[model samples]
Target: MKRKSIFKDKVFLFLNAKQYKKLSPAVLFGGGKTDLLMGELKDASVLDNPATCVIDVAMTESQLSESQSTQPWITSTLDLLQSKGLRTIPEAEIGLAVINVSTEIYCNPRR
Candidate 1:
């Protein structure tokens, strides 16, 4: 009964093959032409920082994949339920993303 808009602070990106076929203009195959694709999930603290979150991602597949996989992913989530948790960031105010810049990986972003 409730609608979830991307306008919410929680952001999710779907880059795998199956979803890609519907959203991307490029073609995908099994093996012949492929590269590595990876994902990175960022918590709200990172996004909350005005100096940080408004970031730009590389458009090139190889560049994006290599860069994301090597970078720190999912380190800032405040998953605990208590007063001791990261206060500047709230429990549900999180930002998650998938950097699907590689090959045939697939999954539904909306669950």
Candidate 2:
């Protein structure tokens, strides 16, 4: 197997554990305690540059519910990273991620 290059572009800032937890698809209930966690597929995107997003979200009936909330989250995060000159891994190549060792990235730059 060919080695995939490690992403040197950026590392998304993980806020406190509380905010870090929010990154997951499952969020705690009552928006306070984590007991009532939402188990639906958590969605994330590239915000303004939707064309560059990488996601594996499950489908839902309510487009507004997903889009309204996720858009700001996506845009704000990207902006926050760029505005403050913070670290971020933009357009990260994920063939090497531990989560996807089973699969492979068949790259075609022209693709």
Candidate 3:
């Protein structure tokens, strides 16, 4: 059932397009477990790079559980990158995705 299933985890990356292209050769040959998808950047800029690139990492729902916390996941991901000799920016923003749904009728009448 949908209610009993765990949700998939998604990681998003915002990088410079030129950097991505430059790095693609290594990334493609690295034989990583994840598949990547690339697309155009509409309106954005990365101070340290030429243009922007967007990448996403989506974990299978079955591989994760509902009770798992994001901290460990993030920590492990960072550790994995570090083990690969990659450096991460300390000031990079991190956050969880959430959606809100509300259905209510409101009426305001002047007294």
Candidate 4:
């Protein structure tokens, strides 16, 4: 029941208000698949970009059962977000949505 945009991979992106607007014309590829969210995000990150305020990333959710544990990719990206003063959702609070293709988290690192 996975959509074409959904894949068995981990990727993330950060887009402020302005950068978010340009995502429409952007193309992403992943794991030989054509939905690389992180790829596009990395491409969009530039020096002149507007102020960064949000963190958006994706990881293989528990829907697969086999990947239910703390996926390493998620924590790795979490480091990036937290270092920039952004928050993320706790592994325990990771909920699923029909279109959750991404995990929306707030910056609240566990101390």
lDDT of 4 at 45: 46
Cα RMSD of all models vs. native, in order, equals 15.0, 13.5, 16.8, 11.6
TM-score of each: 0.17, 0.25, 0.20, 0.27
Clashing pairs in 2: 10-88, 10-89, 11-88, 29-36
Model 1 per-residue lDDT tens digits across residues 1-111 = 222322223222332344334322222211111122323333434334322211212222234456666553333322221122222221112222123322111221121
Residue 40 in candidate 4 has what lDDT? 41
- Between candidates 2 and 4, which one is better according to TM-score? 4
TM-score of 2: 0.25
Query: Over the stretch 38-96, how does candidate 4's per-residue lDDT look in tens digits?
Result: 33434434212333233344443434555555553455555665564444443232224
lDDT of each model, Cα atoms only?
0.26, 0.28, 0.26, 0.35
The CA root-mean-square deviation of candidate 3, after full C-alpha superposition on the true structure, stands at: 16.8
Candidate 4 global lDDT: 0.35
**Which scores better on TM-score, 1 or 3?**
3
lDDT of 4 at 62: 33
Cα displacement (angstroms), candidate 4, residue 65, comes to 1.8
Which ranges in model 4 have alpha carbons more than 4 Å from their true place? 1-51, 68-72, 88-111
After superposing candidate 3, which stretches have Cα over 4 Å from the reference? 1-14, 33-111
Please rank every candidate by TM-score, starting with the best.
4, 2, 3, 1
Weakest lDDT window of 10 consecutive positions for candidate 4 = 27-36
State the lDDT of candidate 2 residue by residue for 51-81, as single tens digits.
2222211222236656765533344543553
Best by lDDT: 4
